[PDB]
Amino acid sequence: VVCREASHAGSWYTASGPQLNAQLEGWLSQVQSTKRPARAIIAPHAGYTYCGSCAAHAYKQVDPSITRRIFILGPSHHVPLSRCALSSVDIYRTPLYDLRIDQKIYGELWKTGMFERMSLQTDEDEHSIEMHLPYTAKAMESHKDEFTIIPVLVGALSESKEQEFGKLFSKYLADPSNLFVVSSDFCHWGQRFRYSYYDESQGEIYRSIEHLDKMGMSIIEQLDPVSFSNYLKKYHNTICGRHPIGVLLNAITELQKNGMNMSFSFLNYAQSSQCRNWQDSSVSYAAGALTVH
Template sequence: MSNRALCREASHAGSWYNASGPQLSAQLDGWLFQAQTSKRPARAIIAPHAGYTYCGSCAAHAYKQVDPSITRRIFILGPSHHVALSRCALSTVDIYRTPLYDLHIDQKEVWDTQSGDWFIISTCLLGSVLWSVAPSNPPFHKDEFTIVPVLVGALSESKEQEFGKLFSKYLADPSNLFVISSDFCHWGQRFRYTYYDDSQGEIYRSIENLDRMGMNIIEQLDPVPFSNYLKKYHNTICGRHPIGVLLNAATELRRNGTNMSFSFLNYAQSSQCRSWQDSSVSYAAGALVVH
């Protein structure tokens, strides 16, 4: 690789963040201030990745659980929205450019973790930016951590297990943080998903019930029930494969005696669907802690 730093510019700059520079920093700090902190720092979080106008308040509940004083490397696992993949993709760029400051990619870790199932691309298409880099109290020192962005394709259950086992050794390290980037139900004709349980009342209540079923299963930290839930309801959780990798990584650590738990802390919807012409996207924020 040449000495010239290869950069990936911010995705959807402007419309995605709804602010820039000091305005964005103040906006993120406001959401973080309103969120509660748990007693133990998160080793992994599940957080939404839509525009901050829609999911910023919800996402803050996950990112508030991050302890910047101990975090040195951040693995960001997100779904492949635009590229058909049956494995995982790593980036060859050195820097992710954000409206706040540049994020440096841990290229040593990228190359050390390669196996035959990785697929290297020049620019990751991850639709999210590390959100907890916003100034907060205590501050996140931008030069004291690196990121490892991983684009997760449509993995089979066996591949989710393989990647989970690979990532488990990193999940065991308290200086590492895993950010699982995922929205939850995408409901409406434009998403080709209109599951509705009329016993729940309004459509948006049926959507929430469906999401919370999945959230309750994720909290069990067992990939098998989550896989069965997806097969039964086909809930359009875009980060289902990154979530599956995390559940398998957690299962591996628990098998080796590590005590951990996962809890969802917040849930929201972009709008409340009441008719078949409506549409919405759901957001959930949760954190995994090691005891």
């Protein structure tokens, strides 16, 4: 098998190519480009009905005229993984057009010894990388034949591994042809998620959720992996891509030590619903962009 099927097409997003193209085009048309060219973005991996318009605030910041190689780091939902994993295939299918894995980088990465290989089953079962494939396809439309992806499944990394993969990915983040997509949703609030932190000083439950998420968002804006780590240990906010976020943060600090200056801005924040009672549940979404100066 050489192709990863678009296994969540038709339920998490439209299976029909022209429809999905139009939908994404409508969402991107609503965002003003303000952070181009993005060297990295954080964007949600929920169904398009939920977070679709949110993710566009990140994808609008991608410059297809410069970007040639797109790493997509997404957390694993299903398998116990204690490191990172690479695909066994060559092509990732999408309803728009199919994407090609950069063999050069995949060969380099593999040789480090640091990665496991996802079976096709694991690969196809996961959605945290897939959710970015149509958006990426759309954003790169005008240069569709000139770019490759580097999908990385990120497991439950120790701090040490976050620092270690941060440093490894560092050299790739430094390259102006490259883009890091880091996949994450923010607060999952509710009894159904065993997470019901509530600060009454903030007002209604949904306001407290907003304050909690925006605290982790500004820390990411401070480009500070230690501080992000401390925030997680203090509140345990249920941020799904906290491990890919910690890898990115460490990549950035390695670059700073080497003379580089950059900034991260969150550009949009949304909630699937507004929780007011103890029986409510919600998932938060945030879209953001790293720009090198």
